[PDB]
């Protein structure tokens, strides 16, 4: 619910894993259409490579299971 995540921009980039539960969750939300629209540009193949990209300062925020 943070305004940065509600107002997508190049400043704060966020992504998930392609073809996962988070993709379905954001695609099925009418209120979060822009969320999925921004997400679609930067999804990752796997969780491990997404974590590696986040640690190496290539991706800002990574949404995944707790």
């Amino acid at each position: 619910n943070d305004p940065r995540l509600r107002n997508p921009s190049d400043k704060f980039i966020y992504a998930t894993v392609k073809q996962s539960s988070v993709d379905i969750y954001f695609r099925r939300q009418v209120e979060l259409s822009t969320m999925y629209r921004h997400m679609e540009k930067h999804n990752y193949e796997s969780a491990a490579e997404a974590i590696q990209a986040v640690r190496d300062n290539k991706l800002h925020a990574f949404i995944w299971d707790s």
């Binding site: 894993v17 073809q19 996962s20 539960s21 379905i24 969750y25 099925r28 796997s46 299971d65």
Partner: protein
């Protein structure tokens, strides 16, 4: 051990959990990942961190959450 059955474990082909998506050169949506392999018949059971959600519960039967 508890249910008295033998098993053969294999990994998913494309490294994705699976969401139904429109198949190329067609208009219908088809499943992929472990979802697609379970529905098609290549796999008989998914033992993996698969998130329970409404979209998957329509085609797949979910056990009690572990």
């Amino acid at each position: 051990r508890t249910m008295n059955f033998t098993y053969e474990v294999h990994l998913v082909a494309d490294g994705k959990f699976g969401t139904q998506e429109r198949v190329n050169n067609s208009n219908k949506k088809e499943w992929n990942g472990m979802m697609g392999e379970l529905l098609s018949g290549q796999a008989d059971m998914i033992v993996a961190p698969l998130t329970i959600n409404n979209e998957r519960a329509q085609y797949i039967e979910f056990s009690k959450p572990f």
